[PDB]
């Protein structure tokens with residue numbers, strides 16, 4: 001009954017990803033007030049990337065796992081390119097979302113006078129162009145495979161080079177931006193609590209800091225726990241050490257972040273309300 | 283003072299508004315009912331109009 | 340003296356109430372009980388007008404039933420072509436806090452006003468082709484809340500200083516002043532013959548004024564809160580009011596009392612605007628809960644709902660031929676609905 | 679139907695010419711911040727307006743660091759029951775000006791200011807709007823407290839049991855008596871402000887004078903803080 005459980009779990013994961021990201025993409029077409037903000041542009045870019053993960057990558061790997069072999073012939077190279085491109089696009093969209101939030105919070109006036117929708121299109125285009133360049137150009141030229149099923153390992157040169165661009169630089173940027181955001185929020189909380197204390201003393205704090213820590217830790221921890229072990233074994237393996245099953249488990253862990261992305265970046269009051277209007281119109 | 287002037291002005295205004303002639307509510311309600319009947323045909327919102335002569339299609 | 344005058348006023352009020360009660364024979368509901376109901380009214384958004392950058396506060400139809408003006412809290416006064424959705428004019432306003440606008444029956448002028456306490460007249464047909472201010476009417480000591488053209492040379496305005504005035508646009512002087520309201524006057528409605536007009540103020544009362552005589556002839560009470568909207572029946576012998584207490588009432592001039600009340604149990608938001616159909620059978624009202632309800636004027640039954648505005652419905656209007664209904668809203672959009 | 683075609687072409691051309699100008703106005707509208715200015719006649723609200731600049735509603739435009747501000751004065755033959763208060767439900771902030779030296783003047787003018795502040799704070803149309811509180815005329819208040827027989831405790835009995843807070847930053851040359859009165863009045867306003875706060879709007883009190891070159895910077899910085907807090911709130915970080 002192990003195979004039945006595995007098939008059910010993989011089907012549930014793919015369905016969750018596809019349903020959630022379709023809901024996110026649909027909630028923006030039905031409402032024109034969400035399309036007026038640029039942060040929503042970045043959110044829908046991330047949702048599109050997650051949809052491409054769920055459609056072009058996940059089902060074919062699950063078929064090979066349930067069947068026990070790769071039945072798609074020469075689709076391995078195109079599938080590998082799709083995998084790299086979609087995952088990279090998701091991570092770069094997350095990095096751009098963090099940078100946008102940091103610029104909004106730290107410089108509100110210059111943000112309002114410089115975050116025209118033209119700049120958002122430039123950022124999105126840069127992210128997607130970087131994804132396509134890192135994936136399809138080296139794979140078609142067979143630079144990903146070592147010079148001396150679809151269960152191979154990347155080349156030594158390509159594994160570290162792609163991991164640095166796709167993961168480590170975006171992770172560094174996100175850490176910097178969210179640390180600065182945390183510091184700003186702490187200063188504001190202290191300033192608010194000082195006035196509250198003055199008024200209380202005239203009459204006769206930890207909750208907010210807990211909320212800030214909860215939000216930031218959820219974001220960062222979900223991202224890092226989903227994608228970090230994969231990008232460590234992605235550079236350990238080409239120099240080999242583990243089997244081909246634990247690596248598949250960590251690959252699936254990395255892909256499952258796209259399932260959770262809608263409820264972390266598109267779950268505010270505006271999106272939650274739009275998720276109820278489209279749910280039975282009640 | 284101005285208070286006595288305001289009070290006397292209010293009393294005078296109330297005097298004029300009590301001198302009007304009032305018809306029965308039965309007659310007034312029938313007149314409005316008859317107006318709607320005599321003009322129900324020419325109300326495009328009450329009776330939907332075919333798209334042949336509708337200028338908002 | 341003060342006690343005597345107060346007692347006299349109370350006795351006069353009691354006499355008026357007694358006369359009104361005596362003249363009441365049967366309710367409007369009893370008379371219109373065998374009338375066949377209108378059924379369900381189904382209207383759809385035929386047009387959507389875009390171009391205003393902020394909340395829309397007022398709109399008005401032209402007498403040709405094609406052109407309409409609207410006002411926004413961004414200093415813009417836009418004239419539309421409702422058939423082709425094109426914009427004919429866009430007038431920048433000196434003050435950004437407009438709250439009313441009107442269209443002249445001739446079609447050569449539009450009016451405007453708000454928190455600046457000024458009513459501005461604009462010439463739409465001039466030699467240069469560009470719209471320029473023709474007159475500024477000063478004299479009110481409160482915000483302009485409504486204005487309505489009588490002809491090309493007269494206009495009646497209501498203000499937040501509890502006063503209505505009649506103006507001569509050629510000289511810019513108040514010909515008549517209508518006093519008697521104790522709260523801020525919020526709305527106006529001219530009779531079909533432009534011989535009388537009704538106003539509704541924040542003292543929860545409505546008054547009927549003789550334009551030439553300059554005196555208040557009748558006062559109507561029954562609303563528990565501020566009256567925000569007022570509209571004459573197409574006959575000219577009745578009118579309807581909308582208030583903050585989430586109800587609409589119909590008053591008869593000859594009966595001198597309220598006839599029908601238009602309320603529902605699941606309505607708690609106030610009425611912003613109110614209007615009638617060409618036959619007078621339907622009563623359309625705008626609400627704070629973002630949609631417009633359609634009422635049967637003779638049965639007080641809700642015959643439909645116009646939904647599709649993202650924010651508060653601020654203004655409302657029915658064309659002179661009865662073809663279409665326009666609604667403006669705080670979401671900065673104008674929608675045109677047809678049967 | 680060539681005449682109809684020409685008419686439609688002219689109408690489309692005029693519409694396009696109109697819509698070109700509406701695009702620049704949209705750009706100008708988004709960069710501007712609207713301010714509602716409240717106060718009394720006896721407060722130094724007029725002199726502050728004159729410094730900022732250097733019938734009905736009065737409007738003042740000024741620009742700081744490429745940010746455009748638009749301030750509106752509603753002191754035009756007004757009264758209570760402010761029906762027009764719903765026109766300003768989407769301004770950046772409210773500037774409330776109080777004459778702190780008018781506690782003794784007559785039922786007090788300071789009590790009238792406190793009642794007006796409490797009325798404005800709890801208004802249903804102003805539930806997401808922050809107030810920049812200008813506690814004006816500090817020199818006159820200092821003169822009254824230092825020399826004179828006008829005891830503050832005579833009019834406000836709670837002054838007999840008030841102690842200067844810990845988060846007090848007196849000027850180097852100020853008497854300890856003057857500091858206590860300033861912070862007593864500030865806390866009198868802050869008690870109203872915090873007794874009914876929603877978490878969607880705050881109060882930014884300042885000790886000002888009518889002739890100051892710092893008030894514009896105060897407004898700028900407080901609006902910057904307001905926008906930053908709104909951003910932090912929309913991301914569940916506040």
Ligand SMILES: Cc1c(-c2ncc(Oc3nccc4occc34)cc2F)n(C)c(=O)[nH]c1=O
Pocket residue numbers: 080083084087088150151152153154162163166234251
């Ligand atoms: C899973 C898998 C692979 C495979 N694909 C891609 C891969 O690198 C990445 N994945 C996601 C995001 C990324 O960003 C930068 C590099 C990168 C590593 C891999 F091991 N290959 C080659 C195979 O043959 N069979 C398989 O099942």
